DNA sequence: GTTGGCCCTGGGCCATC
């Protein structure tokens, strides 16, 4: 049974940032793609080998923002994301501030509840980092009433259900690895927030109903997510 | 990941930017 009822909204989420967790990173870009449960329930499965990449539902809400970090990106981070602190400031990007939190709140309020965030390795990166970024602000966390799941665990379950191999053979569950296994194509616009969100949506549309059920079964409160680091 | 949070039977696995 379900610990928090049926999720009515799935918000696929990705961030770009200044580096990996040990660097105490800051968000440089974020993308939200909100899809209603019904749009997933009515997603048509293809049984092709490989199946074609599914198209996103007609009805979606999308938000994509570039964000000026308080610290510089690592050379690696810059090279893969195509972003830098200097260039973001040049183009007048504002920081992760109260106005952004208010922006996120209004966007989230337009989505039916309960709502569940979906992010690849979200449990170990995206969710803790958002918790940290939002905790810095006086604006109450816009995500405090929302739930969240990690799509890695989701896809491990779904792929292992599909017949072998592996059959106990280990494989990568990186975003790109999954996408390529499922669709035999390289993902496009890699390590851009919107690009990776669309990639995430695609692998989540591989088995729409099975994913929805898994999400409903494993959704936990975002309020329970430990911040990546502290002030 | 160059880390570090997991799972395992002092180490191996492996993903986010
Ligand atoms: Mg990501
Ligand atoms: Mg990304």
Author numbering: 5 to 235
What do the authors say?
Three prime repair exonuclease 1 (TREX1) is a member of the DEDDh family of exonucleases and accounts for most of the 3′–5′ exonuclease activity in mammalian cells. Anchored in the plasma membrane of the endoplasmic reticulum (ER) through the C-terminal domain, TREX1 degrades a variety of substrates to prevent initiation of autoimmunity. TREX1 is, in fact, unique in the DEDDh family for the activity of dsDNA degradation, which enables its participation in preventing autoimmune responses and in restricting retrotransposons. In this work, we solved 4 X-ray structures of TREX1 with representative DNA substrates to delineate the molecular details of the multifaceted catalytic properties of TREX1.
